[PDB]
Amino acid sequence: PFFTRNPSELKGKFIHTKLRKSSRGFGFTVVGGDEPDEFLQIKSLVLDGPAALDGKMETGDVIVSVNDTCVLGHTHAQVVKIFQSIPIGASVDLELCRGYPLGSSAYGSVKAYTNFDAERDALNIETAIKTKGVDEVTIVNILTNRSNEQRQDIAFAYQRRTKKELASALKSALSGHLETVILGLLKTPAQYDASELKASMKGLGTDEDSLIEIICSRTNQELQEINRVYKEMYKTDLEKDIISDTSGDFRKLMVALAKGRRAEDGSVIDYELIDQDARDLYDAGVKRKGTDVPKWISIMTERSVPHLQKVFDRYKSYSPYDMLESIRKEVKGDLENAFLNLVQCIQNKPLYFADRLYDSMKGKGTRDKVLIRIMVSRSEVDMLKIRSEFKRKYGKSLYYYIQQDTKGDYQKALLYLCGGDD
């Protein structure tokens, strides 16, 4: 939460831009400036409007000065009154500072580069691509220290300087697992999830594990973008593809989870409902011979995750087995695997990914597809929590295991995504 009210103590890039207030304002949304030491950054822009048409303003930029007046550390309502008082047709001068991300998970490992230069990085990447023997170290040292958004702009700058999409270029220069890591980093969170989903459903046999990991661990917000982008790329609804390659009660569970319509975190704790769901889960499984499966699917998919965390504790007051052990006894197959993965993500999702990373490396060889997908998909989310749970359980760091199990530039590429030892 870094904040300052002196411009000389900012360390981003400074942009000066002049805007003329249209009939629909300057056409941008501002956020921040609410809790004492808080910045004001650009939430969104209006494509039709003046702020975007000028092009100089980017989202996540901090408003330094508004027409000669420094607004660093001014309240949200103070600087809003400045812009609103500008008459239609009048012009405003904005000094903007970029390098301070608007939104960023506090527990990710890879952080946005402060001195970001999309054009320079695309030029340094093409330098490493064209090098005799290929300079894999440079491509790794660059793309693993940039956020996914910054990688979406480098892929723009690379096409604008080569007329060749950076994906195809790096595909031809890289090989082995290092190629798989880099190609996944160059996809948006929705793109990479949507690609690894379809890839799990190539051929009659399906990679049920990869399917279970992605669907069980993603949030409603993440699943909405996945369902959108999946039809965008593969010309078909993700639900539709799921009905095809899945079947049975396991199909119901995947379709319900993939809909991304879980109830948001309730404002008030439903203690009365926590007891009811806990008893219903008991009535529908271990209390009787047999299993009322749709009751499990309904409760475990429609309740908020904080709620379900508390029913799994309260469920121990009705059942001599916990929710995990009860799943192994009442059900089997891919339905069993799905339920076990699901409640792990509900109880402790970072621990869920820490356990998965340990399984991919504990035996002979590496399950590289699982290791790479987790390091890519959780690098900007909860990688620090994953590393935290990992060392507590297994005694040594996640860094130490990637070091033993992988080698080469591929090893260094994953160690950057890890983000240091523990």
Binding site: G25, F26, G27, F28, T29, V30, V31, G32, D34, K43, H76, V80, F83, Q84
Partner: peptide, 7 residues
């Protein structure tokens, strides 16, 4: 979920 204002 923070407060936004359109300018």
């Amino acid at each position: 979920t923070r407060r936004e204002t359109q300018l």
